[PDB]
Amino acid sequence: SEACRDGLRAVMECRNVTHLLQQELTEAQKGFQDVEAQAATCNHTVMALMASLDAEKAQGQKKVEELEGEITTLNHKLQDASAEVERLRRENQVLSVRIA
Amino acid sequence: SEACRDGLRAVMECRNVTHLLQQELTEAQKGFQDVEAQAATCNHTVMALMASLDAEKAQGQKKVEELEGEITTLNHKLQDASAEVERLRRENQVLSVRIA
Amino acid sequence: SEACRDGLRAVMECRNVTHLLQQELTEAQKGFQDVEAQAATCNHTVMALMASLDAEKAQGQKKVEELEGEITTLNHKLQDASAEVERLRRENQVLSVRIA
Amino acid sequence: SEACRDGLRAVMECRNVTHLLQQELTEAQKGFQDVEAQAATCNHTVMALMASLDAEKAQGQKKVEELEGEITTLNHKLQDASAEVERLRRENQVLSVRIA
Numbered sequence A, B, C, D: 001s002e003a004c005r006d007g008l009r010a011v012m013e014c015r016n017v018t019h020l021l022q023q024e025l026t027e028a029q030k031g032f033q034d035v036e037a038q039a040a041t042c043n044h045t046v047m048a049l050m051a052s053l054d055a056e057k058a059q060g061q062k063k064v065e066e067l068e069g070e071i072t073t074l075n076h077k078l079q080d081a082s083a084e085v086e087r088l089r090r091e092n093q094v095l096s097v098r099i100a
Helices: A002-099 B002-099 C002-099 D002-099
Strands: none
Touching: A002 B002, A002 C002, A002 D002, B002 C002, B002 D002, C002 D002
C-alpha cells in the first residue's frame, strides 16, 4: 500500500546513507595512513638529530683535544725560551761585572 | 598533527552518519509494522466476506427449500382437487343420463 | 605506532560491517516488495469476494422471484379447481334430488 | 505475513550491526587520540633536540674561541721571549769580545 512505499524509501535511504558511511570510512582510513607517514618522518628526524648531536660532541671533543695538544706544546716551548732568557741574563750579568 | 584532526573528523562523521542510519532503520521498522496492520485488516476482511458468502448461500438454499415445500404441498392439493372434479364430472354425467 | 594498527582495524571492521548492513538492507527491500505483491493479491481477492456476494444475492433474489411466481400461479389454479368442485357438488346435489 | 517477519529481522539486524559500527568507531576515535598524543611528544622531542644542537654548537664555538685565544697569546709571548734571547745572545757576544 502507501505503507510499502514508505518502508521502501526508508530502505533506499539506509542504502544511500551507508554509501556515505563508506566514503567517510575511506577518509578515516586515509587519516590513519597519513598519520603513519607523519609519525615515520618525525621519528626519523629525531634519529637524524640525535646523530648530529653525537657527531657534534665527537667533533667538539676532538678539536678541543687537538688544541689542548698545541697548548701544552707551546707551554713547553715557552718554558724553554724562558729558561734560555734566565740563562742569558745571568751570563750577561757576569760578563758586565767582569769588564768592571 | 593536521592529519589527526582529519582522521578524527572522519570518525566524528561516521559516528554522526550512523545516527542517521539508525533513525532511518527505525522508519523502515515502522514501515514493516504498518504494512502488517493493513495486511491484518485485508486478511480479516477476506474472512468476513467468505463468511457472508457461506451465510448468503445457506439462506438462499433454505428459503428456496422453504418455497419448494409450499409448491409440492400445493401440487398435492391441486391433484386432489383435480381428482374430485374428475369424480364429480363422472357422477354428474351418470345422473343426467339416469334422468333421460 | 601500535595505535595505528588498532585504528586501522577498527576502520576495516566498520568497513566489513557496513557490507553486512548493505546485504541486510537488500533483504529488507525484498521484504517490502514481496509484501506489495501480497497486498495486491489480498486487495484483489477482496474484490472477487464482493463480486461473488453481489452475484449470489442477485441469483438468490431472482430465483425466489421465479418461485414466488409459481406459488401464486398454483394458488390461482387451486382456486379455480376449488370453484369447479363447488360448482359440480351443487349440480350433483340438484340432480340426485331430481331423481328422488 | 512471513515476509514481514523477514523484513523485520533484516531491520533488526541493521540495527544490531550499526551498534557494532558505533563501538568500532569509538575504537577508531581512541586510535587517533592515542596517536595525536604521540605526535605532540615526538613533535616536542624534535624541538628539544634542535635546541641541544644549537646549544652544543654555541658551546663548541665558544670553547674553541676561548682556547685558540690562549694559543695566539702564547705564540705572542713566545716571540717576545725568543726576541729577548736574540738580544741577549748578541749583547753577550759583544761583551766576551770586549774582554778579549
